[PDB]
Design a protein around this ligand. Structure first.
Ligand SMILES: CCCCCCCCCCCCCCCCCC(=O)OC[C@H](COP(=O)([O-])OCC(O)COP(=O)([O-])OC[C@@H](COC(=O)CCCCCCCCCCCCCCCCC)OC(=O)CCCCCCCCCCCCCCCCC)OC(=O)CCCCCCCCCCCCCCCCC
Ligand SMILES: CCCCCCCCCCCCCCCCCC(=O)OC[C@H](COP(=O)([O-])OCC[N+](C)(C)C)OC(=O)CCCCCCCCCCCCCCCCC
Ligand SMILES: CCCCCCCCCCCCCCCCCC(=O)OC[C@H](COP(=O)(O)OCCN)OC(=O)CCCCCCCCCCCCCCCCC
Ligand SMILES: NC(=O)C1=CN([C@@H]2O[C@H](COP(=O)(O)OP(=O)(O)OC[C@H]3O[C@@H](n4cnc5c(N)ncnc54)[C@H](OP(=O)(O)O)[C@@H]3O)[C@@H](O)[C@H]2O)C=CC1
Ligand code: SF4
Ligand code: SF4
Ligand code: SF4
Ligand SMILES: [Zn+2]
Lengths: 94, 206, 288, 386, 176, 111, 48, 114, 38, 154, 94, 45
């Protein structure tokens, strides 16, 4: 931040950029190192009623694998063919 | 339901249909086909079928599993064939993954799949090193992870966590030496399993 | 036995050998093998040193965590000697020098210092005492070194009657001043391997019979000095007035004293280990 | 003649140590035989003696340049087996720090590649940027590297107040830093001489040899798991996948530089779309309760006690879960036997298959090119050896 | 969506061909690189003057361990062993018995700081804020043995650093 | 087309002719497989479907869209792969009955 | 402190020349900062 | 009792490979002693080879024998190509291990192990 | 093609276990008793 | 006499602690924090600790990461080839005593089983600043050496 | 409440001290035995008993969520105080 | 008390550049060669 105006011009010209607008050294734009206390929200299971665990028990909804064939018509692929990607409109060529 | 992972029945149905497809085409080798509740397809095969099944899945136009994601082994000592060989394949054409599993024991070799996937070269060296499964017709089978002269296969369930030997530098012989392992603090085994059943859906019959 | 010094384990690095040893002279040629062997089996080793801590670093990896303890000490300060041996069950004296210096003469290192160590060890209640003398110690030697070895050998026995005195021949090994001495440049020599001397010292600690005895540690074969020097130059593919006098003293034959065999150690032939020592510098007939 | 490469360069390097046994004829390399296992630490066996939570820090130490991305891969695998879902705010935080981690990895990959080729200066400029990103890690987790922040169920703690403003200030200037790096390298004829047409791999070979990530896209393959098999909230952000045309070291370098720019583009959307709410799944049988609840409610105390001693049980099953890690496809084949400790955890490191292809890629090149090819694969031996 | 990083046709008109010949013969793009390093020469360096200046840290920082007390001076630890159970490195060793006044307190509390991975799971697991990772990170030693902390060392760390530890916990406890 | 975009995959001058030959060879090879083998029934079905599209569509861009197998040179590569597989399937004969059943508890998880 | 300096150089300590009986004129180290100042010097807080 | 072979279909075929491997190890020992500058003699090295072979002399399963030869060849390749270092070769001799008691009385004095 | 092996299965020589921990160990095969506290 | 030996010790100690050329064994993640100590914020070069140093030109070895059994002989060899005076800094839990992998079959439980160690830097990883504190602590260890004082009194 | 044994070695708050013939005290020669001087058993005994009106009182160690889990203490017995099982504070019904 | 957690400012953050920016500088090929040749001619003269 404290470079002389001549030195600012020299390193701007040499680099070809406006370095002063995006200095890699941090000054006072950063957040204060002491912040006000948070007050964090609670999740959707924080209820006093209509909140029985057996209605929101993901672990107990898991099942053993479905057995399709055990050693005890149109052809198919494992999924539909992937759709061809589109060229970026933001910038197709670097 | 915010905390529960949502189902995807469309993919479950697609994978089931393709599972039957593979079983119908390779009945000589396929022993079981299952789709997990989170939509993953596993083809369980006889070990003789490794090359035919993998080749089919790589080259068939309705499969095209061109990429071998991972090849590994699992040790289950209670099984007559304690080693389960797991191939995780990926198809970029159909944006899908399949898993192929076979089995072997300590003395029965498995055909090397290097001819199907060049990726298999080192994966099979690692399985040989860590589990002691021999792969027939492997171009260059030898240890890859363990130290030279290391005895045993550390990923077997009956290999001790800290092994049998440990190294130190000895001034008298002016070299690093190997000696039987002694620990200043033994690893403390914990019994964590609750005596109460957790998941009724997986209860085995008495 | 105090409960803390009952042996436990399998004789390895993390084991407890029950030995609590203070090794004076541990930073030298013989001391590094003695400390290593003590640390191999999980002994507590106290290492009083005169040198800079930098010169003790090679001893650090020789024991498990906490098993090697370093202390400062002065040869002429008895309080520093007492602090080192106060808690030990054995004291090993390997102090010595092959030359004299301005501050320490042969009488200082081979008489006054060993006597002071032995006296403080007895006053401290130390049970065992190992003292290294020399096979050719004699009060009629042309060598001031060997004369002092004899006087000190007598004072140690008087002060610590239960001391185990060991009298090795010239010792050969990687860090010796014997084979290396010849590779850098009538009499009959019986050189003894460093590891044999070390094993014998370790066995004298564990052997209750060795108390009060004097041992002579010698190699298997006797070599005419000329044949020995020619052999060294062949294997190698190629000083002070006192040192020359010592080297030209014929190794005394003392059949009355017990040797390595009595301590369960098998003397290593020179020919087996000659290459090991002299490889970095790149068979003599014995006397039956 | 036979020759062995040194374990590592004579300047600080953090990729690990490699024993490369080579066969040469004149200047040309005829055979490359990497000898690894020098950083094999039996991670996969150690995990079997840990609860699912206890094993999470092991993933920080695999590809230890992409810590939180490795955490994400393991967390997703356990969440899948648990059949639970992390809350939306945690998913956005995971994507935000996943892309910050991608920046950390790509700086290390590009600048140490240049440093080993002799271009020392960019390493110093861009590692000041890495130092500032280490501060973001430290402010959310208390650790600069091995955060252990992303866990099954969400993240450990919410962002501290004021952190997102600082991430914005950093991101605002980063593209300029990339431009300075490109000024040094992109058009440099010496850099192009060291990278152009070096280590060419065909699209067909790259697939069969098990390659992933930039090692595929450099050869024109249009594949990125964030696009094709999206996880967390990657389907909700816009970005482009850079694709190469020559399949050589230079194109892969361009892909990594452009990916850094796309990571900034994603970070920008994450900073603006961050939702409110809780940051770990509101299921106390999986995620521990808040400390205030643990100290007041009987149920919360029990669940806290059990989650930190036994840990949660995972339903029996096996999953292969993969993500687009900065080095490529990073996956875990995780086997649960129904208990609170995993039965088997195989780790798929993208650098494992990439390094296995070093001999193929180095054919017909000179000794100095071997250094360039190792750099273009971006190999860290924590993930290779595990 | 994708983009090409290197799919461009150089123009073959004479003006463009001569631009590339000028770059080849006159080293223009090499001169440009010299401009960039010159500009850095005149930038203020990023170096700080350690140990007089220190790198910034946050209250959450995981540093040297300490055992804490209540305001009355009683130890917070009640030997529940949750920290010992969760520790991923098995770095913690605890023994306990009834204290002479009947209290539930430890007789051994060891942390092997060379096993520890400084992960902070112990302080997450602790139900009474007894074991914490403090802000200190400058405790390197000359011997291995000095890093095997016993209970007295950890209590001394708590008494040494409590002033900072308490303020840091005050700053972050609402995020926990 | 100047380039396929995939390194090592050359452009094909005559893709319609190349596919017609390859798909015809595949159908010829499948004739040596038993009529009841599922591989023959399925492979013939998809091969005939693609062969018809090649005959219906003389525009490569519009043919590529119909087939949905990437670039036309990717379709040709996949046809060469299928033909290679078909020849190998004749020696493996995977339509035969299961070579052997696994031990009773081989695929039981958890144990 | 000097808040015109960039973050990192904006706070510093000039160590005492003697601490706990040790001559620290030339030999200084980071462990000499007491905990109440440790927090401020490392920017864990804004208030000294 | 019908199994897939590794290499040899019976013990006679397996014993041919064992003898071929012994020949290769026997001829390698002099080179190993020179290359690694070992302090052991060639006779000591060849005696070590014999001892390692002898300890497996009781096997009667051709598959187990195949694996032993497979591993023995791997060990030889490590030695010939000098992938091993001096320490790895000398690990066959356990020079720093103190002899462990064999008879009942010696074991009884030193601990509880059988 | 398969071969015939009538030997009793034994892998002691190919597991890498030291002889001391094969021949002097006593394995106990049991179903653990219920923890009486629960 | 004693005055001249005392000052010569100060001069040689000053030269050696002011010109510490490190050989870094970048074994695992700890090496990353070592690179950050070389990076601009800390710039170890400004203390005289050069960036690039050959093993035969080195005065201090920094063991930055896990030491495996497979790697231990090679690390010892590099230490043995170091010209004296030579010092070893153990950085991080793995190097200090095995750390997270202490109970692994393939890991050396502390590099001090292979080489003598002068400074142990704790952490997993230690921060770049904690490593720099350790290097500064080694410098003060060298400052306390009395090599000529000991030699004079021999 | 530190006290030195007959050999001069301080006893810790856990009662540890090497006895007379224990070699292990050699580790402290030239160094020191780290002993914390603030014995918690003595410090908690200096706290006054708190006089309360109700039969049942609750303690959370003070500081709200920065204390210990909140427990409730019965004060019916008049022969002794109610002692908090976490922090050792004592209460008595008045 | 209202919920207070780290959130973006109302209206979001300002734009963040990410595309490559390597500005063009210097003369054309013709101009540079002319300058170089003119320098030689003056030197020769
Ligand atoms: C042989 C040649 C060397 C011997 C000749 C000595 C030349 C005079 C040097 C005096 C420098 C003193 C600067 C000063 O007052 O300190 C400010 C400083 C406090 O200032 P500050 O608050 O930090 O603010 C500084 C600026 O804001 C931030 O810094 P800044 O960069 O923005 O400005 C500082 C100033 C400093 O410039 C100078 O004074 C030196 C100019 C001569 C250059 C010699 C080459 O630079 C300028 O003003 C630019 C004009 C100077 C000409 C620049 C030409 C650059 C080359 C052109 C491009 C071509 C590239 C190829 O006080 C000090 O710390 C004093 C330290 C003394 C260091 C030693 C300097 C003497 C050099 C050794 C002498 C022989 C022994
Ligand atoms: C040939 C001539 C050699 C000239 C010797 C130059 C010594 C300069 C010097 O020691 O710096 C002062 C040094 C600097 O002190 P320092 O090196 O201990 O620490 C300086 C403060 N820090 C490190 C925080 C920046 O003073 C001394 O420490 C005394 C050593 C004197 C050595 C000279 C022996 C005569
Ligand atoms: C050196 C100090 C740094 C100068 C700043 C760099 C600079 O501005 O030069 C960039 C300029 C543009 O070149 P470039 O972007 O590569 O495009 C092709 C040519 N227009 O490129 C140039 O104009 C550089 C011209 C160099 C002239 C040749 C020098 C010969 C030296 C011997 C006389
Ligand atoms: N080597 C041989 O061939 C034989 C040796 N011996 C005896 O074995 C013992 C050791 O042999 P070796 O180890 O080869 O001798 P070294 O000279 O190799 O070691 C000598 C030891 O004595 C210490 N020492 C020497 N002078 C003093 C002193 N004035 N004050 C304090 N400590 C001192 C040295 O410490 P620092 O390192 O500080 O100098 C060193 O530790 C000696 O007693 C020697 O006489 C007996 C017969 C043969
Ligand atoms: S920080 Fe982690 S590794 Fe260290 S003691 Fe605590 S739980 Fe164990
Ligand atoms: S420190 Fe905390 S978690 Fe550990 S035993 Fe004590 S009270 Fe329990
Ligand atoms: S101590 Fe921690 S950071 Fe260092 S190598 Fe080991 S795991 Fe990685
Ligand atoms: Zn209380």
């Amino acid at each position: 931040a404290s470079a002389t105006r001549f030195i600012q011009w020299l390193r701007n010209w040499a680099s070809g950029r406006d370095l002063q607008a995006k200095l890699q050294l941090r000054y006072q734009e950063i957040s204060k190192r002491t912040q006000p206390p948070p007050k964090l929200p609670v999740g959707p299971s924080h209820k006093l009623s209509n909140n029985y665990y057996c209605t929101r028990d993901g672990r107990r909804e898991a099942m053993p694998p479905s057995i399709v064939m055990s050693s005890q018509k149109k052809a198919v692929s494992p999924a539909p063919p992937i759709k061809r990607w589109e060229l970026s409109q933001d910038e197709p060529y670097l | 339901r915010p905390t529960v992972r949502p189902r995807n029945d469309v993919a479950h149905k697609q994978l089931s249909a393709f599972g039957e497809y593979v079983a119908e085409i390779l009945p000589k080798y396929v022993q079981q086909v299952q789709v997990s509740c989170f939509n993953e397809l596993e083809i369980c095969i006889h070990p003789d079928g490794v090359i035919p099944v993998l080749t089919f899945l790589r080259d068939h136009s309705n499969a095209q599993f061109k990429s071998l994601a991972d090849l590994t082994a699992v040790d289950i000592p209670t099984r007559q064939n304690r080693f389960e060989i797991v191939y995780n394949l990926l198809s970029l054409r159909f944006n899908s993954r399949i898993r192929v599993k076979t089995y072997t024991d300590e003395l029965t070799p498995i055909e090397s799949s290097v001819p199907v996937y060049k990726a298999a070269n080192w994966y099979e060296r690692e399985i040989w090193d860590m589990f002691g499964v021999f792969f027939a017709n492997h171009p260059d089978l030898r240890r890859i992870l363990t130290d030279y002269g290391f005895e045993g296969h550390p990923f077997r369930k009956d290999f001790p966590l800290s092994g049998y030997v440990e190294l130190r530098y000895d001034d008298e012989v002016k070299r690093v030496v190997a000696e039987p392992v002694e620990l200043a603090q033994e690893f403390r085994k914990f019994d964590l399993n609750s005596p109460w059943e957790a998941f009724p859906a997986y209860r085995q019959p008495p | 036995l105090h409960h803390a010094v009952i042996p436990h384990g399998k004789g390895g690095r993390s084991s407890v050998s029950g030995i609590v040893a203070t090794v004076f002279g541990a930073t030298g040629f013989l001391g590094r093998y003695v400390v290593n062997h003590l640390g191999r089996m999980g002994s507590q080793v106290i290492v009083p040193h005169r040198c800079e801590p930098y010169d003790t670093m090679h001893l650090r990896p020789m024991g498990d965590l906490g098993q090697i303890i370093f202390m400062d000490w002065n040869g002429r300060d008895k309080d520093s000697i007492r602090r080192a041996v106060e808690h030990s069950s054995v004291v090993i004296n390997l102090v010595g020098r092959e030359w004299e210096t301005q501050n320490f003469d042969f009488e200082d290192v081979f008489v006054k210092i060993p006597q002071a160590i032995a006296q403080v060890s007895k006053e401290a209640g130390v049970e065992k005492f190992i003292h290294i003398s020399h096979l050719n110690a004699d009060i009629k030697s042309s060598s001031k070194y060997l004369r002092s070895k004899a006087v000190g050998e007598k004072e140690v026995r008087e002060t610590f009657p239960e001391a185990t005195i060991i009298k090795p021949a010239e010792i050969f090994g990687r860090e010796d001043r014997f084979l290396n001495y010849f590779a850098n440049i009538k009499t009959v020599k019986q050189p003894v391997y460093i590891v044999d001397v070390t094993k014998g010292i370790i066995n004298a600690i564990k052997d209750p019979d060795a108390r009060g005895k004097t041992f002579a540690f010698v190699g298997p074969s006797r070599y005419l000095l000329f044949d020995l020097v020619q052999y060294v130059f062949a294997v190698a593919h190629r000083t002070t007035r006192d040192k020359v006098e010592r080297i030209h003293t014929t190794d005394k034959i003392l059949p009355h004293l017990p040797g390595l065999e009595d301590l369960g150690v098998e003397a290593t032939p020179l020919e087996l280990k000659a290459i090991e020592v002299l490889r970095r510098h790149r068979p003599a007939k014995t006397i039956p | 003649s036979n020759l062995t490469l040194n374990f590592g360069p004579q300047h600080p390097a953090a990729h690990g140590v490699l024993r490369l046994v080579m066969e040469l004829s004149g200047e040309m390399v005829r055979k490359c035989d990497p000898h690894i296992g020098l950083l094999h630490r039996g991670t996969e066996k150690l995990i079997e003696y840990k609860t699912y939570l206890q094993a999470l820090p092991y993933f920080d130490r695999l590809d230890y340049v992409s810590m939180m991305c490795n955490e994400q891969a393991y967390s997703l695998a356990v969440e899948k087996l648990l059949n639970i879902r992390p809350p939306p705010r945690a998913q956005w935080i995971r994507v935000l720090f996943g892309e910050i981690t991608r920046l950390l990895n790509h700086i290390m990959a590009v600048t140490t590649h240049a440093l080993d080729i002799g271009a020392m200066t960019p390493f110093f400029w861009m590692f000041e940027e890495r130092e500032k990103m280490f501060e973001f890690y430290e402010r959310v987790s208390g650790a600069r590297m091995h955060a252990a922040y992303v866990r099954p169920g969400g993240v450990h703690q919410d962002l501290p107040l004021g952190l997102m403003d600082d991430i914005y200030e950093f991101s605002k200037n980063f593209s300029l830093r990339i431009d300075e790096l490109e000024e040094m390298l992109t058009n440099n004829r010496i850099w192009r001489n060291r990278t152009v047409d070096i280590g060419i791999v065909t699209a067909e070979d790259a697939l069969n040899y098990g390659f992933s990530g930039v090692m595929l896209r450099g050869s024109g393959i249009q594949w990125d798991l964030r696009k094709t098999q999206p996880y967390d909230v990657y389907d909700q952000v816009e970005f482009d996948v850079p694709i190469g045309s020559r399949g050589d070291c230079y194109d892969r370098y361009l892909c990594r530089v452009e990916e850094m720019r796309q990571s900034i583009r994603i970070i920008s959307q994450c900073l603006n779309k961050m939702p409110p709410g809780e940051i770990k799944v509101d299921d106390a049988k999986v995620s521990p309760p808040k400390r205030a609840e643990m100290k007041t409610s009987m149920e919360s105390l029990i669940h806290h006690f059990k989650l930190y001693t036994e840990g949660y049980q995972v339903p029996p099953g096996a999953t292969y879960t993969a993500i687009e890690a900065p080095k490529g496809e990073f996956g875990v084949y995780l086997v649960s036997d129904g208990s609170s400790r995993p039965y088997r955890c195989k780790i798929k490191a993208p650098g494992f298959a990439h390094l296995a292809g070093l001999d193929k890629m180095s054919k017909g090149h000179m000794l100095a090119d071997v250094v360039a090819i190792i750099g273009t694969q971006d190999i860290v031996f924590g993930e290779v050896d595990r | 969506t994708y983009k090409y990083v290197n799919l461009r046709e150089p123009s073959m008109d004479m003006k463009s061909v001569t631009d590339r010949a000028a770059q080849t013969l006159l080293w223009t793009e090499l001169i440009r690189g010299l401009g960039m390093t010159l500009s850095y020469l005149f930038r203020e360096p990023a170096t700080i003057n350690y140990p007089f200046e220190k790198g910034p840290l946050s209250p959450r920082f995981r540093g040297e361990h300490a055992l804490r007390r209540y305001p009355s001076g009683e130890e917070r630890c009640i030997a529940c062993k949750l920290c010992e159970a969760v520790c991923p490195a098995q770095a913690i060793t605890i023994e306990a018995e009834p204290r002479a006044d009947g209290s539930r307190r430890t007789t051994r509390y060891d942390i092997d700081m060379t096993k520890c991975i400084y992960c902070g799971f112990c302080q997450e697991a602790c139900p009474v804020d007894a074991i914490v990772e403090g802000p200190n990170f400058e405790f390197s030693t000359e011997t291995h043995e000095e890093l095997l902390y016993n209970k007295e060392k950890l209590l001394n760390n708590g008494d040494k650093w409590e002033a900072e530890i308490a303020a840091n916990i005050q700053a972050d406890y609402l995020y926990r | 087309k100047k380039t396929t975009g995939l390194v090592g995959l050359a452009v094909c001058e005559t893709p319609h002719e190349r596919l017609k030959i390859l798909y015809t060879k595949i159908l010829d090879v499948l004739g040596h497989i038993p009529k009841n083998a599922a591989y023959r029934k399925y492979t013939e079905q998809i091969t005939n479907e693609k062969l018809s599209m090649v005959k219906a569509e003389p525009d490569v861009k519009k043919l590529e869209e119909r087939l949905q197998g990437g670039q036309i040179e990717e379709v040709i590569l996949q046809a060469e792969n299928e033909l290679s597989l078909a020849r190998k399937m004749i020696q493996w004969k995977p339509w035969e009955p299961l070579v052997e059943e696994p031990p009773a508890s081989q695929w039981k998880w958890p144990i | 402190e000097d808040n015109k300096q960039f973050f990192g150089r904006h706070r510093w300590v000039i160590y005492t020349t003697e601490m706990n009986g040790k001559n620290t004129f030339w030999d200084v180290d980071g462990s000499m900062v007491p905990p109440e100042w440790h927090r401020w010097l490392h920017c864990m807080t804004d208030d000294p | 009792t019908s199994v897939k072979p590794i290499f040899s279909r019976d013990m006679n075929e397996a014993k041919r490979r064992v003898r071929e491997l012994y020949r290769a190890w026997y001829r390698e020992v002099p080179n190993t002693v020179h290359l690694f500058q070992l302090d052991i003699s060639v006779k000591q090295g060849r005696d070590k080879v014999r001892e390692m072979f002898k300890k497996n002399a009781h096997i009667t399963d051709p598959r187990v024998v195949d694996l032993l030869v497979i591993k023995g060849k791997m060990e030889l390749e490590e030695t010939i190509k000098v992938w091993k270092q001096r320490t790895h070769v000398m690990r066959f001799f356990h020079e720093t291990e103190a002899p462990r008691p064999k008879d009942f009385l010696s074991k009884f004095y030193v601990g509880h192990d059988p | 093609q398969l071969i015939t092996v009538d030997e009793k299965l034994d892998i002691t020589t190919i597991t890498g276990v030291p002889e001391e921990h094969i021949k002097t160990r006593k394995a106990r095969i049991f179903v653990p008793a219920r923890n009486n506290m629960q | 006499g004693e005055y001249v030996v005392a000052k010569l010790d100060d001069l040689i100690n000053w030269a050696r602690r002011s010109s510490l050329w490190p050989m870094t064994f970048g074994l695992a993640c700890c090496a990353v924090e070592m690179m950050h100590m070389a990076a601009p914020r800390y710039d170890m070069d400004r203390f005289g600790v050069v960036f690039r140093a050959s093993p035969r030109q080195s005065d201090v070895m920094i063991v930055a990461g896990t030491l495996t059994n497979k790697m231990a002989p090679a690390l010892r060899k590099v230490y043995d080839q170091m010209p004296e005076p030579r010092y070893v800094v153990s950085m991080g839990s793995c190097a200090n005593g095995g750390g997270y992998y202490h109970y692994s079959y393939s890991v050396v439980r502390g590099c001090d089983r292979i080489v003598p160690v002068d400074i142990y830097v704790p952490g997993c990883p230690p921060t770049a600043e904690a490593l720099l504190y350790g290097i500064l602590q080694l410098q003060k260890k060298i400052k306390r050496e009395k090599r000529l004082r000991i030699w004079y009194r021999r | 409440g530190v006290r030195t044994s007959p050999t001069g070695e301080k006893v810790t708050h856990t009662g540890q001290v090497y006895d007379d013939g224990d070699y292990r005290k050699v580790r402290f020669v030239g160094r020191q035995k780290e002993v914390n001087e603030n014995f918690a058993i003595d410090l908690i005994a200096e706290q006054p008993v708190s006089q309360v009106g109700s039969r049942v009182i609750s303690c959370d160690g003070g500081g709200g969520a920065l204390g210990h889990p909140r427990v409730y203490i019965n004060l019916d017995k008049e022969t002794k105080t109610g002692t908090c099982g976490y922090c050792g504070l004592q209460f008595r019904q008045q | 008390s209202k919920v207070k957690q780290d959130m973006p400012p109302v209206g979001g953050y300002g734009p963040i550049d990410y595309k490559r920016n390597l500005p063009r500088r210097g003369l054309s090929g013709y101009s540079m060669f002319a300058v170089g040749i003119g320098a030689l001619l003056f030197g020769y003269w």
